Amino acid sequence: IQRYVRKDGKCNVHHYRYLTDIFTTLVDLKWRFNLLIFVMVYTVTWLFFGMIWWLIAYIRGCVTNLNGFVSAFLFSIETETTIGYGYRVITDKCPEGIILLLIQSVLGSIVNAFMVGCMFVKISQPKKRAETLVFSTHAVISMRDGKLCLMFRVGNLRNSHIVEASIRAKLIKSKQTSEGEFIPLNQTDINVGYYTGDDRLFLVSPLIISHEINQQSPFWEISKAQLPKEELEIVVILEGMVEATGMTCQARSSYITSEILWGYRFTPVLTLEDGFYEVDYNSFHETYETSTPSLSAKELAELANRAESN
Amino acid sequence: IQRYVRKDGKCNVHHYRYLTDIFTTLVDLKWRFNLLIFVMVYTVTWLFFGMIWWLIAYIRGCVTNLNGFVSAFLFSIETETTIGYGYRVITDKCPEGIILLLIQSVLGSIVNAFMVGCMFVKISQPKKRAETLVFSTHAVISMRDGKLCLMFRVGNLRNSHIVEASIRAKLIKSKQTSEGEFIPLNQTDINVGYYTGDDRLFLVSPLIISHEINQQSPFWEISKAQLPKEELEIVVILEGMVEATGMTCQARSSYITSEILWGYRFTPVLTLEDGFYEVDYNSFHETYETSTPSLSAKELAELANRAESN
Amino acid sequence: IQRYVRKDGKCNVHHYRYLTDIFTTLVDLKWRFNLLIFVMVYTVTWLFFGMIWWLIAYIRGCVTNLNGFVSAFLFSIETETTIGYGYRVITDKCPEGIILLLIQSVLGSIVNAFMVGCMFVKISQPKKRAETLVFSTHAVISMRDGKLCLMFRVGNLRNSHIVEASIRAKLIKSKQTSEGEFIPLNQTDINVGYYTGDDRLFLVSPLIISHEINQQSPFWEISKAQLPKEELEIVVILEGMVEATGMTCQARSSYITSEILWGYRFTPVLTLEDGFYEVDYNSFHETYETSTPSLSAKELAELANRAESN
Amino acid sequence: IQRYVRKDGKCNVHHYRYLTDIFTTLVDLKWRFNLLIFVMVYTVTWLFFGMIWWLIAYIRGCVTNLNGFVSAFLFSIETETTIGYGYRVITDKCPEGIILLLIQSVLGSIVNAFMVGCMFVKISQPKKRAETLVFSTHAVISMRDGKLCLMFRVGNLRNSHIVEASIRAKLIKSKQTSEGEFIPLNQTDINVGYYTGDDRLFLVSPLIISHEINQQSPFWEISKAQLPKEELEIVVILEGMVEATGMTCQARSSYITSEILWGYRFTPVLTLEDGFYEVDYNSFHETYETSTPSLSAKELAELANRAESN
Ligand SMILES: [K+]
Ligand SMILES: [K+]
Ligand SMILES: [K+]
Ligand SMILES: [K+]
Ligand SMILES: [K+]
Ligand SMILES: [K+]
Ligand SMILES: [K+]
Ligand SMILES: [K+]
Ligand SMILES: [K+]
């Protein structure tokens, strides 16, 4: 079976109450659609009012300088667009015209107010900054001061902060319960700092996120040899608020069994030049292999505790 | 007595400082109300200014092409709606007219700015996306790798994420204190992942939320037999931010004693077809019963610890 | 010395970089101020451009139907307010006029866009909903299933939720360190659910917040008799997001030594009528006294542990 | 090597997918840029439409009172700015003109709606309130009721709250792993209240943040004498939401080895005058030295435990 989350963040799952917010069905779409639909609803109000204008216009013979429905449209414009050329002006004789304008004048400033709002949000869409946050292309497993770690690397490309940025990881893997319940893409959390507040990053330059593999880690029992065989996939989530706007964004990625590398280790990406720190974004995804025991974290521990014991 | 929260999210409780924010009294209402009140306040400003316009107009005899108060309204329009037909134009002779326009011109662009804002928020109301988040219709109680669990199922229907989505549960049940204090619909939290960060979901496909029933669970003492008799109600809360807009939404639901099912178990809703995961939303609320001890979680434990002991 | 926070939420403390956000100096003010300043800056742009218009107008003799600076103002209006009467129209002969309009036309739609924004936020100010959240007028201390508690009561008046609502408390009291450092209004946290997630409320009807007084509570050593003498003040903070808008609000209050009541107990405010829960907001602040040991929580404990011991 | 974060908050690090949000590349810039670019895109639409207007205008000979491209611009204005002088009015004879206006009329109210939005956010930028939050200029190390502390001081200058304000600290220092991995500006968290909820401030007057130096602190092994030699830098982060708007802001600062002062102690900044608390912001950064053991926190402890032991 094939992966839940694509390396780039989109998921591999497809799914009446979408009119309960006819708002959000709009915001997901793409530009040329909106631009036309904007016009669609803009165009139609001019038909709608232009028909109703001609409805009370035909009854009359409130109207100056018109000939057909070609003029009911261009009058409907001088109104809603509040252009008002003053060639086709309003006149007093009839008691019907004013209160239609009043219907329109308000409604035309409603159609605008509705649709400055949606434009704004479309522009301001947070998910866009999900582009300028990046993950390393592989995760690695290797030793760090005695304990075995699973490490992936995280980055922010834009010169400005993404405030309140945290991270979490989820292990996805089907399992069976002693009882017999199969649970298809079951999700359990991976400790990446939660308990100390170390998962609350400070993302000014690329950081290495490190999950230590201990009795509670999923990778406790997994040795180098077993790893390739294992059918797990690690989902990785960076969440934070765009300094620029309070908008709260999220960046996902994924590691599948074959993208975790046993015994390797990230290239450093930092150096100092004339007062600024230099990120060599070339070295970002790069890793190298070092000497790394091949045993599971568990077997590795016992070999330690037998040493201290003797 | 009858339930606190309706399966759909509204609560069964009814309640001077509502003018301390005359803002929020507006936003709760329904469309046809606003649409009229918008017009109400729109219409009245044209009366108000039109009266005041005629006030200084009568004194004059700043005014061109008017006859009655029929013209003070249509002039009041060419101003506020900034239409300005140029049939009824301003003129210099009087020192009074300009500074009224200046009162209006600003105020007309105030009445707009006020009421693009409220339109926007009404459109953008987060609570709307509370529709596209769903809970299972029943909760169940059954075994999962040895420990007894209370499980309900949670979903997101819309193809897009609801960011930073967490969950919590509250047990509502009246109680008495040794002391004698009766406490009517008293609320205590149910562990659904809080301590590990497992309550911080990743809601891409329906998940099963599971509260393990241990010494600290409310359901420690409750056996299958006792359950029907118990007068509890579990309130369930999903909170998160709409990816689309930073708006922070909340979805509630409820389980009452008779909607928890002992010994059952959710149907899986997942399958893989040609590269996409298939949610069979038909199987969403569906459960089946499996073999499940009928004892309380407590009695079930002791029977275990007596086994290990011997 | 006198209290830090007034029962109503304002604090009793008074305080170059206020132009680093000339934004927020604006939003704190009151309506009549804005309304005038709006006009102030609106009025002045018409002077400013009207002077500059007459500057290039005098040079000319781009201009139709003007006499003095009375017309440079009313032309400056038909421009910025985009009214454009078409009595005073633009003309081609001069190469200077168009690019000033272009300066203005853009700037007039800037002055608007600037000041729809601030209007909006002023309207939408979250702190307003700090009015519809209420605290009980007193806190009490009395027993709850064996342990001694400090309890105050919290409410939401508006029929709609305030999402993600939590609570915290701070103990304020000057102290001295063995070392000798005096620390004037020093602040330490009071446990009101933090460790279990019980401080994350569900505020649909008034709840009683309860801090159990244990070895870690500030009130461990304080007996009934000592209480009046103690110079402490408890600050109470309710934080949450307005369901209506993502705006994140905060409601404070305070308890000083003499407003905590030993041995009392809140009146219940709940009852059920024909399917709706009835909050008797009359009974909201009301308490009564019950039988309550007068000893400190500490002395009360030891008397227990000596009992179990024997 | 030189510091990661400047005392004022900017970092000392410099860094295709910046068009994936051409939104945020805009908001970082400075006023005079926007003001011109606004005009840039405003000016060009009048060229663009004015050319296209003349395109179908030349074909004609929909047009009244024009001479060259000087009029195609001033007509393009009476349209987009919705000024509509009514000297140059629309006419019926041609079937081409109306649907271009309809292209424009909508697009002109799009260019506006786009660029009220960005104006707004630029105005409302949260990072601005990062100016009115301040840190003390030095941190100090000295005793507080027996335990050794690292303390820095934090403030809010503006009379209004910054809601939900928390604090965290990061220790930055390169290190080597037994294994051999060098890790250049490696980041580990410093406890400043996280575990008790004491890092969740109530910032009404300047507070002293205190990290107790215990077995888990980085400063466990560091004595007064060693301190100057150590190459560490403490990064300090205040995060919270502007009461005024939900915008979520962040304020950083930094302490390098030589800005931590062993044996000193902050001057109190509080006093009471006629009912208001007086902050003497003069005493804000000020410290004095007191009698302070010079040993590391570790050696200091053992000397204690040897005392209790005997
Ligand atoms: K914690
Ligand atoms: K927000
Ligand atoms: K107009
Ligand atoms: K106009
Ligand atoms: K006009
Ligand atoms: K925790
Ligand atoms: K916790
Ligand atoms: K006109
Ligand atoms: K905690």
Coordinates of N, CA, C and O in Angstrom, one line a residue, chain B residues 1-5 11-15 17-18 20-21 23-24 27 75 78-79 82-86 88-90 92 98 101-102 105-106 113-114 117 120-121 125-127 168 170 175 177-181 183-185 187-189 194-195 199 235 237 239 247-248 250 252, chain C residues 38-39 42 46 67 70-71 73-74 77 81-85 87-88 112 115-116 119-120 123-124 128-129 131-132 143-146 156-159 161 163-165 194-198 200-202 204-205 207 241 243-246 265-266 268 270 272 275-277 279 281 288:
Chain B
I1 N -34.2 14.1 34.5 CA -33.8 15.4 33.9 C -33.1 15.1 32.5 O -32.6 14.0 32.3
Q2 N -33.2 16.2 31.7 CA -32.7 16.0 30.3 C -31.5 16.8 29.9 O -31.2 17.9 30.5
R3 N -30.8 16.3 28.9 CA -29.4 16.6 28.5 C -29.0 18.0 28.3 O -29.8 18.9 27.8
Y4 N -27.7 18.3 28.5 CA -27.1 19.6 28.5 C -26.7 20.1 27.1 O -26.9 21.3 26.8
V5 N -26.3 19.2 26.3 CA -25.9 19.5 24.9 C -26.6 18.6 23.9 O -26.6 17.4 24.1
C11 N -26.6 24.1 23.1 CA -26.8 23.7 24.5 C -28.2 23.9 24.9 O -29.0 24.7 24.3
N12 N -28.6 23.3 26.0 CA -30.0 23.4 26.5 C -30.1 24.3 27.7 O -30.8 23.9 28.7
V13 N -29.5 25.4 27.6 CA -29.5 26.4 28.7 C -29.9 27.8 28.1 O -29.4 28.1 27.0
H14 N -30.8 28.5 28.8 CA -31.1 29.8 28.4 C -30.7 30.8 29.4 O -30.8 30.5 30.6
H15 N -30.1 32.0 29.0 CA -29.8 33.1 29.9 C -30.8 34.2 29.9 O -31.6 34.3 30.9
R17 N -25.4 45.2 29.5 CA -24.0 45.1 29.0 C -23.9 44.5 27.6 O -22.8 44.1 27.1
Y18 N -25.1 44.5 26.9 CA -25.1 44.0 25.5 C -25.0 45.3 24.5 O -24.9 45.1 23.3
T20 N -22.6 47.5 25.6 CA -21.1 47.6 25.8 C -20.4 47.0 24.6 O -19.2 47.4 24.4
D21 N -21.0 46.1 23.9 CA -20.6 45.8 22.5 C -21.9 45.5 21.6 O -22.2 44.4 21.3
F23 N -21.8 45.7 18.9 CA -21.2 45.0 17.7 C -21.7 43.6 17.6 O -22.2 43.2 16.6
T24 N -21.6 42.8 18.7 CA -21.9 41.4 18.7 C -23.4 41.0 18.7 O -23.8 39.9 18.3
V27 N -24.1 40.6 14.9 CA -23.5 39.4 14.2 C -24.1 38.1 14.4 O -24.0 37.2 13.6
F75 N -30.9 64.5 -3.7 CA -29.6 65.2 -3.5 C -28.8 64.6 -2.4 O -27.6 64.4 -2.6
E78 N -26.9 61.6 -4.2 CA -25.8 62.0 -5.0 C -24.6 62.4 -4.2 O -23.5 62.6 -4.7
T79 N -24.8 62.5 -2.9 CA -23.8 62.9 -1.9 C -23.2 61.7 -1.2 O -22.0 61.4 -1.3
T82 N -22.1 59.0 -3.1 CA -21.1 59.7 -3.9 C -21.4 59.5 -5.4 O -20.5 59.4 -6.2
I83 N -22.7 59.4 -5.7 CA -23.1 59.3 -7.1 C -22.9 60.7 -7.8 O -22.2 60.8 -8.8
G84 N -23.5 61.7 -7.2 CA -23.3 63.1 -7.7 C -23.7 63.3 -9.2 O -22.8 63.5 -10.0
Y85 N -24.9 63.3 -9.5 CA -25.4 63.3 -10.9 C -25.0 64.6 -11.7 O -24.7 64.5 -12.9
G86 N -24.8 65.7 -11.0 CA -24.3 66.9 -11.7 C -25.5 67.6 -12.4 O -25.2 68.4 -13.3
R88 N -28.1 68.3 -10.1 CA -28.2 69.0 -8.8 C -26.8 69.2 -8.3 O -26.2 68.3 -7.7
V89 N -26.2 70.3 -8.6 CA -24.8 70.6 -8.3 C -24.7 71.6 -7.1 O -25.6 72.3 -6.8
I90 N -23.5 71.7 -6.5 CA -23.2 72.7 -5.5 C -22.9 74.1 -6.2 O -22.4 74.1 -7.3
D92 N -21.6 78.4 -5.1 CA -20.7 79.2 -4.1 C -21.4 80.2 -3.2 O -20.9 80.4 -2.1
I98 N -21.0 74.1 2.2 CA -19.7 73.3 2.1 C -19.5 72.5 3.3 O -19.2 71.3 3.2
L101 N -21.7 69.3 3.8 CA -21.2 68.3 2.9 C -20.0 67.6 3.5 O -20.0 66.4 3.6
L102 N -19.1 68.5 4.0 CA -17.9 68.0 4.8 C -18.3 67.1 6.0 O -17.6 66.2 6.3
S105 N -20.0 64.0 3.7 CA -18.9 63.3 2.9 C -18.1 62.4 3.8 O -17.8 61.2 3.4
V106 N -17.7 62.9 4.9 CA -16.9 62.1 5.9 C -17.8 61.0 6.4 O -17.5 59.8 6.4
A113 N -17.7 52.3 5.8 CA -16.6 51.7 6.5 C -17.0 50.9 7.7 O -16.4 49.8 8.0
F114 N -18.0 51.4 8.4 CA -18.6 50.6 9.5 C -19.2 49.3 9.0 O -18.9 48.3 9.5
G117 N -17.3 46.3 7.2 CA -16.7 45.5 8.3 C -17.6 44.4 8.8 O -17.2 43.2 8.9
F120 N -18.4 41.7 6.2 CA -17.2 40.8 6.1 C -17.3 39.7 7.1 O -17.2 38.5 6.7
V121 N -17.4 40.1 8.4 CA -17.3 39.1 9.5 C -18.5 38.1 9.5 O -18.3 36.9 9.8
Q125 N -17.8 34.3 9.3 CA -18.1 33.6 10.5 C -17.6 32.1 10.6 O -18.0 31.3 9.8
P126 N -16.7 31.9 11.5 CA -16.0 30.6 11.7 C -17.0 29.5 12.0 O -17.0 28.4 11.3
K127 N -18.0 29.7 12.9 CA -19.0 28.7 13.4 C -19.7 28.0 12.2 O -20.2 26.9 12.4
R168 N -11.0 17.7 23.3 CA -11.1 17.5 24.7 C -12.5 17.0 25.1 O -13.4 17.1 24.2
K170 N -15.5 16.4 28.3 CA -15.9 16.8 29.7 C -16.9 15.8 30.1 O -17.8 15.4 29.4
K175 N -23.3 15.7 41.5 CA -22.7 14.9 42.5 C -22.9 15.6 43.9 O -23.3 16.8 43.9
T177 N -21.0 16.3 47.8 CA -19.7 16.1 48.5 C -19.9 15.6 49.9 O -21.0 15.9 50.5
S178 N -19.0 14.7 50.4 CA -19.1 14.2 51.7 C -19.8 15.2 52.6 O -20.7 15.0 53.3
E179 N -19.3 16.4 52.5 CA -19.7 17.6 53.2 C -21.2 17.9 53.1 O -21.9 18.4 54.0
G180 N -21.8 17.6 51.9 CA -23.2 17.9 51.6 C -23.6 18.8 50.5 O -24.7 18.8 50.1
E181 N -22.6 19.4 49.9 CA -22.8 20.3 48.7 C -23.3 19.6 47.5 O -22.6 18.7 47.1
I183 N -24.0 19.5 43.6 CA -23.4 20.3 42.5 C -24.0 19.8 41.2 O -23.7 18.8 40.7
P184 N -25.0 20.6 40.7 CA -25.9 20.2 39.6 C -25.4 19.7 38.3 O -25.6 18.5 38.0
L185 N -24.7 20.4 37.5 CA -24.3 19.7 36.3 C -22.8 19.8 36.3 O -22.2 20.5 35.4
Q187 N -18.8 19.5 36.1 CA -18.0 19.2 34.9 C -16.6 18.7 35.3 O -15.8 19.4 35.9
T188 N -16.2 17.5 34.9 CA -14.8 17.1 35.0 C -14.2 16.5 33.8 O -14.9 15.7 33.0
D189 N -12.9 16.8 33.5 CA -12.3 16.5 32.2 C -12.0 15.0 32.0 O -11.7 14.2 32.9
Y194 N -4.4 14.4 26.4 CA -3.8 15.6 27.0 C -2.4 15.4 27.4 O -1.5 16.2 27.0
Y195 N -2.1 14.3 28.2 CA -0.8 14.2 28.8 C 0.4 13.8 27.9 O 1.5 14.1 28.2
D199 N -3.8 14.4 22.0 CA -5.1 15.0 21.8 C -5.0 16.0 20.7 O -6.0 16.6 20.3
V235 N -19.5 15.4 27.1 CA -19.5 16.4 26.2 C -18.2 16.4 25.4 O -17.2 16.2 26.0
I237 N -15.6 18.1 22.5 CA -15.3 19.4 21.9 C -14.1 19.3 21.0 O -13.0 18.9 21.4
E239 N -11.7 21.6 18.7 CA -11.3 23.0 18.5 C -10.2 23.2 17.5 O -9.2 22.4 17.6
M247 N -9.4 32.4 11.6 CA -10.6 32.2 12.5 C -10.5 30.9 13.2 O -10.2 29.9 12.6
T248 N -10.8 31.0 14.5 CA -10.7 29.8 15.4 C -12.0 29.3 15.7 O -12.8 29.9 16.4
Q250 N -15.0 26.0 16.8 CA -15.3 25.0 17.8 C -16.6 24.1 17.4 O -17.6 24.6 17.1
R252 N -19.0 21.0 19.0 CA -19.4 20.2 20.2 C -20.3 19.1 19.7 O -20.8 19.1 18.6
Chain C
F38 N -10.8 61.9 12.2 CA -11.1 61.4 10.9 C -11.4 62.7 10.1 O -10.8 62.9 9.0
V39 N -12.3 63.5 10.5 CA -12.7 64.7 9.8 C -11.5 65.6 9.7 O -11.2 66.2 8.7
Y42 N -9.4 64.3 7.1 CA -10.2 64.5 5.9 C -10.2 65.9 5.4 O -10.0 66.2 4.3
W46 N -8.1 68.2 1.9 CA -8.8 69.1 0.9 C -8.2 70.5 0.9 O -8.3 71.2 -0.1
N67 N -13.9 80.2 -9.3 CA -13.8 81.6 -9.0 C -12.7 82.0 -8.0 O -11.9 82.9 -8.2
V70 N -12.8 78.9 -2.8 CA -14.1 78.3 -2.5 C -14.4 77.2 -3.5 O -15.2 76.2 -3.2
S71 N -13.9 77.3 -4.7 CA -14.1 76.4 -5.8 C -13.0 75.3 -5.8 O -13.2 74.2 -6.2
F73 N -11.8 74.0 -3.2 CA -12.2 73.0 -2.2 C -13.3 72.1 -2.7 O -13.2 70.9 -2.6
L74 N -14.3 72.7 -3.4 CA -15.4 71.9 -3.9 C -15.0 71.1 -5.2 O -15.7 70.2 -5.6
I77 N -13.2 68.1 -3.7 CA -14.2 67.2 -3.2 C -14.7 66.2 -4.3 O -14.6 65.0 -4.2
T81 N -13.6 62.4 -2.9 CA -14.9 61.7 -2.6 C -15.4 61.1 -3.9 O -16.5 60.4 -3.9
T82 N -14.6 61.2 -5.0 CA -14.9 60.7 -6.3 C -16.4 61.0 -6.6 O -17.0 60.2 -7.3
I83 N -16.9 62.1 -6.1 CA -18.2 62.6 -6.5 C -18.2 63.1 -8.0 O -19.0 62.5 -8.8
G84 N -17.4 64.0 -8.3 CA -17.2 64.5 -9.7 C -18.5 65.0 -10.3 O -19.0 64.3 -11.2
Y85 N -19.0 66.1 -9.9 CA -20.3 66.7 -10.4 C -20.4 66.9 -11.9 O -21.5 66.7 -12.4
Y87 N -19.9 69.6 -13.4 CA -20.0 71.0 -13.6 C -18.6 71.6 -13.7 O -18.3 72.3 -14.7
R88 N -17.8 71.2 -12.8 CA -16.3 71.5 -12.8 C -15.6 70.3 -13.3 O -15.3 69.3 -12.6
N112 N -9.0 56.6 2.3 CA -10.1 55.8 2.6 C -9.7 54.4 3.2 O -10.1 54.0 4.3
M115 N -8.5 54.2 6.5 CA -9.4 54.6 7.5 C -10.8 53.9 7.4 O -11.8 54.4 7.9
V116 N -10.9 52.8 6.7 CA -11.9 51.8 6.8 C -11.4 50.8 7.7 O -12.1 50.3 8.6
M119 N -11.5 52.1 11.5 CA -12.9 52.0 11.8 C -13.3 50.5 12.2 O -13.7 50.2 13.3
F120 N -13.1 49.6 11.2 CA -13.4 48.2 11.4 C -12.9 47.7 12.8 O -13.8 47.2 13.5
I123 N -14.7 49.1 15.8 CA -15.9 48.4 15.9 C -15.7 47.1 16.5 O -16.4 46.8 17.5
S124 N -14.8 46.3 16.0 CA -14.6 44.9 16.3 C -13.8 44.6 17.6 O -13.7 43.4 17.9
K128 N -14.4 44.6 24.3 CA -15.8 44.9 24.5 C -16.5 43.7 25.1 O -17.2 43.8 26.1
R129 N -16.3 42.5 24.6 CA -16.9 41.2 25.2 C -16.3 40.9 26.6 O -16.9 40.0 27.3
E131 N -16.9 42.8 28.9 CA -18.1 43.2 29.6 C -19.1 42.1 29.9 O -19.5 41.9 31.0
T132 N -19.3 41.2 28.9 CA -20.3 40.1 29.1 C -19.7 38.9 29.8 O -20.4 37.8 29.8
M143 N -14.9 23.1 52.5 CA -14.4 21.8 52.3 C -15.2 21.2 51.1 O -16.4 21.5 50.9
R144 N -14.5 20.4 50.3 CA -15.0 19.7 49.2 C -14.4 18.3 49.2 O -13.3 18.2 48.8
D145 N -15.2 17.3 49.6 CA -14.8 15.9 49.7 C -13.5 15.8 50.4 O -12.6 15.0 50.0
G146 N -13.3 16.5 51.5 CA -12.2 16.3 52.4 C -11.2 17.3 52.3 O -10.5 17.6 53.3
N156 N -20.4 33.4 31.7 CA -20.7 34.0 30.4 C -22.1 34.3 30.2 O -23.0 33.4 30.4
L157 N -22.5 35.6 29.9 CA -23.9 36.1 29.9 C -24.5 36.0 28.5 O -25.7 35.6 28.4
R158 N -23.7 36.3 27.5 CA -24.2 36.2 26.1 C -24.5 34.7 25.7 O -23.7 33.8 25.9
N159 N -25.6 34.5 25.0 CA -26.1 33.2 24.6 C -25.1 32.4 23.8 O -25.3 31.2 23.7
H161 N -21.1 31.1 22.6 CA -19.9 30.6 23.3 C -18.8 31.7 23.2 O -18.8 32.5 22.3
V163 N -15.2 30.7 22.7 CA -14.4 29.5 22.3 C -13.0 29.4 23.1 O -12.5 30.4 23.5
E164 N -12.5 28.2 23.2 CA -11.1 28.0 23.8 C -10.9 28.8 25.1 O -9.7 29.2 25.3
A165 N -11.9 28.8 25.9 CA -11.8 29.6 27.1 C -11.1 28.9 28.2 O -11.5 27.8 28.6
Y194 N -4.6 23.7 35.7 CA -3.5 23.5 34.8 C -3.0 22.1 34.6 O -2.9 21.8 33.4
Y195 N -2.7 21.4 35.6 CA -2.1 20.1 35.4 C -2.9 19.0 34.8 O -2.3 18.0 34.3
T196 N -4.2 19.1 34.9 CA -5.1 18.0 34.4 C -5.8 18.5 33.1 O -6.5 17.7 32.4
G197 N -5.7 19.8 32.8 CA -6.5 20.3 31.7 C -7.9 20.7 32.1 O -8.8 20.9 31.3
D198 N -8.1 20.8 33.4 CA -9.3 21.2 34.0 C -9.5 22.7 34.0 O -10.5 23.2 34.5
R200 N -9.2 24.4 31.3 CA -9.8 24.6 30.0 C -11.3 24.4 30.2 O -11.8 23.3 30.1
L201 N -12.0 25.5 30.4 CA -13.4 25.4 30.7 C -14.3 25.0 29.6 O -13.8 24.9 28.4
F202 N -15.5 24.8 29.9 CA -16.6 24.7 28.9 C -17.8 25.7 29.4 O -18.7 25.2 30.1
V204 N -20.7 27.2 29.4 CA -22.0 27.4 28.9 C -22.9 27.9 30.0 O -23.8 28.8 29.7
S205 N -22.7 27.5 31.2 CA -23.5 28.1 32.3 C -22.4 28.4 33.4 O -21.3 27.8 33.4
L207 N -19.8 28.4 36.2 CA -19.1 27.3 36.7 C -18.4 27.7 38.0 O -18.1 28.9 38.2
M241 N -11.4 33.1 23.0 CA -11.7 33.7 21.7 C -13.2 33.8 21.4 O -13.9 32.8 21.7
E243 N -16.5 33.5 19.8 CA -16.9 32.6 18.7 C -17.1 33.5 17.4 O -16.5 33.1 16.4
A244 N -17.8 34.6 17.5 CA -18.1 35.4 16.4 C -16.9 35.8 15.5 O -17.0 35.7 14.3
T245 N -15.9 36.3 16.1 CA -14.6 36.6 15.4 C -13.4 36.0 16.1 O -13.4 35.9 17.4
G246 N -12.4 35.7 15.4 CA -11.2 35.1 16.0 C -10.6 35.9 17.1 O -9.8 35.3 17.8
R265 N -20.0 29.1 50.9 CA -20.3 28.2 49.9 C -21.3 28.8 48.9 O -22.4 29.3 49.4
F266 N -21.1 28.7 47.6 CA -22.0 29.3 46.6 C -23.4 28.6 46.6 O -23.6 27.4 46.7
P268 N -26.4 27.3 44.5 CA -26.6 26.8 43.1 C -27.4 27.7 42.3 O -28.3 28.4 42.8
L270 N -28.5 26.7 39.1 CA -29.2 25.9 38.1 C -30.5 25.3 38.5 O -30.7 24.9 39.6
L272 N -34.1 23.2 36.0 CA -34.7 22.8 34.7 C -36.2 23.1 34.5 O -37.0 22.7 35.4
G275 N -37.6 21.9 29.4 CA -36.6 21.6 28.4 C -35.4 22.5 28.2 O -34.5 22.2 27.5
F276 N -35.4 23.6 28.9 CA -34.3 24.5 28.9 C -33.7 24.6 30.3 O -34.4 24.6 31.3
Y277 N -32.4 24.8 30.4 CA -31.9 25.0 31.8 C -32.0 26.4 32.1 O -31.7 27.4 31.3
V279 N -30.9 29.4 34.3 CA -29.9 30.1 35.2 C -30.6 31.2 35.9 O -31.2 32.1 35.3
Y281 N -29.7 34.0 37.5 CA -28.6 34.9 37.6 C -28.8 35.8 38.9 O -27.9 36.5 39.2
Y288 N -23.7 31.1 51.0 CA -24.2 30.9 52.4 C -23.0 30.2 53.1 O -22.1 29.6 52.5

